[model samples]
Target: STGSATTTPIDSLDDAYITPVQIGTPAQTLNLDFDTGSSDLWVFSSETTASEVDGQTIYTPSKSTTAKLLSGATWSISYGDGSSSSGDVYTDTVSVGGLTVTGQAVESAKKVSSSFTEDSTIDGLLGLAFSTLNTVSPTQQKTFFDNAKASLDSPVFTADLGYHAPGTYNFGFIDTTAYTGSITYTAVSTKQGFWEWTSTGYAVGSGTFKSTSIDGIADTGTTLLYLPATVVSAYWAQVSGAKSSSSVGGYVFPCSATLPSFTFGVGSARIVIPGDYIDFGPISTGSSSCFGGIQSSAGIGINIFGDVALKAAFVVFNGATTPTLGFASK
Candidate 1:
């Protein structure tokens, strides 16, 4: 978000979460989250206490024939969420799918917080977002893309976050098979930790919402879609019998009835997040309401289109070829 514009799918391998073409050979495989918010590939190491590394995949350098630690350049990264991990930097020959990339930079965490150290199931996180957002750089250092870019078959990589269905999160070269002929591409504005843009305006049912022309951004890290307060109210007004109720810190409506469809326009391109993506599940509020995909961000200045909106589209981040983002259908 705070760096060059590029997009990639977050993946889960065994228990470890990885980006496409990246692999973590932990002592045993474990699930991990792929984070674009920060750079640095780290996994719990064998030196950690058993209790600390529980449920996590530990990397045994001795067992992995291709492992080699970088001389003197150690790394430690702390998250804004208060989680932290520190370890030595290492280079290894790693493989993902049928592709192999050698001299891959990885982190072996010797000291990790309880949140990470205690979860044995989590092997490590792969940082493939951008170089500027890296946590380990004194200045800006080489990111996973910087190293692996040479091996990719295509200049672009797409992240396909499907529903909870199989093959939900997939990466690698954009599958042209999934889309029509062309893909919609947008220019990325360098801003804060979110990809933001001005919306041309909003549309409800089949018509346009007033003041629809505004700026917004697409963020995969956030879980819900957030828009300006006025935008949220105007959008909900169009839905028949859509009375607002406070639950889950936002407005919700009855799930029994069909809801109106809305579209957010970016230049000539429009991103339509269907209503089903809104009421994800029944909420604690009175009505059989699910979480509304759209929420009000009263104080927050920027708009955010979270995972709900991203799931329906194939986002291709072209870091290797050019600094651009391309969106296509799954």
Candidate 2:
């Protein structure tokens, strides 16, 4: 049987879904964001400066006898969204659901940038991407999945990231109950340590899918759907008053506008995102303008199929020898 866990929502932040994880001997529980975009299991800890901590629960490693510091080892990492964290490493027992990985390298943050400090909800991140992306200096650390793969029934996991509602993360097996129809599988190319593939273009409304072949990543960490410049332009072209607004940071349109549904294709699957999902909501408090969830990924380098896109389907991040992504509609 596969190990599975439920993730709860952060009140103010609708995009991030977090799950409980246990670390150390006596089981220090923390609510961490399960990120497929990165490979670091870092937490806000006792080591974090008082000023750096918001209202997060800190992991006190000294209390756990099983915890061991990796002498002279350190790590530093920054996310695409500008959020950053860095600290020393400690090996301990880490568990997600019923799956326990012994001697897992847990990075404890001594200092965190405002991006993390300000969030104030989630304690840390549980990165499920390839272990190669782990940030330990001198020696790269293995992710919880990588370390525990051999013990799993099948080396696979599924991500069911919901919109503003609660979602789930499943390990070792596919939850057929979570999705409908057949799961369409695609060959994934993770050259840059991301779950990416070539999407064969997209369409607005109930239109035919134009074949453009855009390369993008399936990131659970990101909040919105980001496409290429031309793709983003084409999407907004149909909406009136939808323009690139520097102040809003993405394309914005009148909140009163009726939005068209969007679609992107996999190997043999067509995932459709509803119009309302793209209408990201008003740019600011009491503003008439609304932000577009589908934005330009120009500066970020690669397009991201964030919560907006993933929420449209029940996705399987199959961690096989040649990794592949399986998509199904709910």
Candidate 3:
């Protein structure tokens, strides 16, 4: 009826987060990215070409007695970062933490982009976004949460993402002790198949909260916070020596520069992201320039409150008849 799992960052910069998952009979364990930005439970598998295989673990369906191919089923997914994967599908028993879901679709990748192959820390991805975003065709497949929701005591899940540390993901019920104060509930617009919501506004450091509507999606898969160019420019202006750099790929500054905290409103409640978290990391090895965790969403088309912002609070993805999101400070 309920389950909890720990997720850890894949790198020191908190580049990505991953959780362990068990799939098929006898249970092959793989570290997967629990992505709330996409819906496709795919994995590197026996079908993957040898050239594409790196140090990542591969799922062997043939070894699982309970594995069954989903006839004529296939899937392909591409991320905004240009990484992608495509494959056939299989149904198998899947487990996360202690909860189990039978006959869950397990996509077996036949092809993977170089970005995925280079990142050996991730075996695959476990999508938590709305099933409507699933890339599977012929017959759309449900995400793990969707398949397990009916069996859960509550059709909801929560993400407590940590800053450069291990975090927890809880299903079926919220852990009241995990967050302080009451949660601010917001209606989610799943029309785009994302956990989209509008923030009341934001404040740079301890500055006044600009009472403006900031629409964005809460995405765990994304590594940084991307806001409107005007907002991003304003935030960076507060930091001395910080400048938008095309060669460095984003806003970069002297590594020794003092950084300011970022705050975004969830209803009237504000979630404050510490300054240290904004000092993303160095642009290069031993480079004196560092990248900013917050960037402009100009070409991105959509603003994103990614892990950079999500790590500041406990977030609930309520999968009720009408989906909603809850945010609480910790």
Candidate 4:
């Protein structure tokens, strides 16, 4: 039988998109952030210290007859944002939508960083990066996509991240009704465990599109677009109040600044990100300060097209023999 599922975007903090998944026999539902920037399906668990667990719904392996520990094995990982987590491992049935992967490696966290602890809505992270990026030791782990691909009618998934609205993630199939216009494709390289590509150039508002190329990753898990310092500076120059904020560690601007739309070239196609989405909400509850959705990726080496940018267009993740990315005007 063909396999496919639709993932709904739930309410989340300023940083991520969340989805619900089932793990273990009879199923224990957990809300996980489907991260494409890294690999590792780790969940908050009973092993975590009581204080650290907070409001997270932990997975209890002992409660599931199908759960088994892979003794002598453990996994640890950290993110670009300085957040980290580590824990032991377990093998059990995991399902998303109706796609099931039996004997899936579910890393149970014994420790987590303040990022995960403070964001209590997230129970765990469901990594969608290549399996090669899994951090489990003694035996590497496999991601949900990696485990379910072989059985899918189509070896692909589609990410439809929308603005302050609900978005959908589809596996093994693409919904034609969700988007308009034909999808323009560009070849992608996953050597570094990212859906990366080089753009021909970009422009602000209606400015002339340059030929300056940019190498970046399509990271669904990331919240903002982290571009090169030069690009970041150029874009900010267009917004009156935009400037580097030592406090935010990135660019901040007045909420009323007139931000221009951003457009970038992918192959021969151009996708535009509306300026309306440029204001990533207020900097704080009582402050008129606002964070620009785009920032400098200087330290990270590669630019990131995060939810801020990806949500502007319809995207397709082709995970077949030759990985490719498809984008269309939404």
Candidate 5:
């Protein structure tokens, strides 16, 4: 009725998180990105173009006895970073952690973007967002979480993303010991198929806590914290030697610059992110310039509280009739 899985960071910069997933009867294991930002369970599979295949693992449906092709059904998804993947559909036994979902829609990739192929981090993506966002045509498929909710002890999932270590994803129930302080719950809007919520306000390091509402999505697939240009500029201004650079992408500063901690409000609860977490990493190997974990959302349209913010707390995606998001310090 419940399941749990371990999510590991892909690179030193904590670019993304990956979890091992089991697909089909024979159980071919592939590391997949548990993306809460998208709604499509697609993978690099036998159908993928050979030239597009790199060092990533591929799912072979033909090897699974339970696999059944979903004739005429297809899916295509594009991410904010411009990476995309599309393919035909198949119904197969899919499992995450110890939970099983029979007849789960397994989108087999026939085409993948260069970014996905070039990076050997994950073979596919397991969307945790609302199933309404699913890209499957004609009859949109449900997300793994949506299908598994009925069998779960509780219709909820939690994300415990780590900095440089492995984290846990819990289904059906919350791990009380996994976080400190009482959890703060907030109303969530699934209009865009995202766990969108309003943040109370923010404070730069130990500075004043501005009482303003900021709307954003809690995205596990995203790597950095993006906010309005004014807020982003305020935070960066506190960091000595910090500057925005289009050439380097976003904001960058001297590797040795002292970064100020960031704090945001959830209901009445305040979550704080350490300065070290904002340091992100050097722009290049042995480079003195380091990219900031927090950036402006000027061009992004909507603000995103990505891993940079999620890593600082324990997050719960409550799948009740009226969806809600809960946050707590870890």
Candidate 6:
């Protein structure tokens, strides 16, 4: 039984963090960055100029007999990292696993720069996260889930990362083996194009983060957790001998040796963050210690609880109903 509405809202760069997924066909395998911060499905195309096709998955129209181009329409998007892509629109029958969604919207980059062309293994990005940012025009919008929803048995998509293992990107219906109980879902809110909610503080290994009491919002679009500096420093202080390290331009620490279990409370549900994610990638040179995924971004209005934190808990983003987002547990 699926749980009903609770009225809530609601990464980073690691090469090992990448996941594999089938794009145009089972034979055409592509490596994708499973991102939940933005909403859009993008890939390189054969029609794109040779300069633009570098280091990305160029979807060749000639390879697929079912490809169709949307004449007179072009798209371009600039990421926060200063990388961008511009291409014409195309539609084709795409499949993931046994599921096939026809007439799916795709982009064929006409021009791209060296920054994007350098990453040969990084073909495209799969934006599974919620957002108002769409590459397609308002009149002809397309989303990975939007086009594939009808074909899915439950109209649901799940991102099940392997047990701290590489190449763990799996999409489709939720696998029952991951969790034991029935999944609960929350209704989506229409206030913003995001899945927003008021977080009721945090719990580390079943202990509350603070006594004053505060509320926060969860965002997959962000790579780190942005909270008041006081809150961030206070939380880190709890770990014995925890020290700050510079990584991703944020305050992180080496807690691999003394890593502690943590959980964030959203009402009564507890979302856990394992030690592996807690002790993130290297920050300083020659240091094998990993940086803490959570950090303080003082003065920032938007508090985002990115994937590194969210992966610890089972989450569901329901877009089937309008004006609200659904949340559930695995």
Query: Model 3, stretches more than 4 Å misplaced?
Result: none
After superposing all C-alphas onto the true structure, candidate 6 shows an RMSD in angstroms of 5.8
Ranking by lDDT: 3, 5, 2, 4, 1, 6
Q: Could you give candidate 6's per-residue lDDT for residues 243-285 as a string of tens digits?
A: 6655356655563466666566555555666655666666656
Q: Write down the lDDT that model 4 would get.
A: 0.86
> How high a TM-score does candidate 6 get?
0.77
The TM-score values for the models, in the order shown, are: 0.73, 0.97, 0.99, 0.96, 0.99, 0.77
What candidate 6 gets wrong by more than 4 Å, as runs, is: 1-27, 47-55, 80-82, 112-115, 129-132, 166-172, 181-184, 209-224, 239-248, 255-257, 288-290, 297-300, 322-330
Residue pairs clashing, model 2:
none
Between 3 and 6, whose TM-score is larger? 3
In candidate 6, residue 203 scores what lDDT? Answer: 60
Better of 1 and 4 by TM-score: 4
**In model 2, what is the error at residue 282, expressed in angstroms?**
2.0
Better of 3 and 6 by lDDT: 3
Question: Which order, best to worst by TM-score?
Answer: 3, 5, 2, 4, 6, 1
lDDT of candidate 4 at residue 2, scale 0 to 100: 36
lDDT string for model 2 (1-330, tens) is 467888877754466888999999899999999999999999999999889999999999998889999888899999998889999999999988888888999999999999788887889999988888999999999999888888888989888877667888889988879998989898899788889888877988876778888888888888889998998898898898889989768899998899888899887678889887786677888888988888999988888998889888999988889999989998
RMSD of 2: 1.3
TM for candidate 2 is 0.97
Off by over 4 Å in 2: none
Clashing residue pairs found in predicted model 4:
none
Residues 1-330 of candidate 3: C-alpha lDDT, one tens digit per residue: 999999999999999999999998899999999999999999999999999999999999999999999999999999988899999999999999899999999999999999999999999999999999999999999999999999999999999999989999999999999999999999899999999999999999979889889999999999999999999998999999999998878899889988999999999999999999898878879999999999999989999999999999999999999999999999
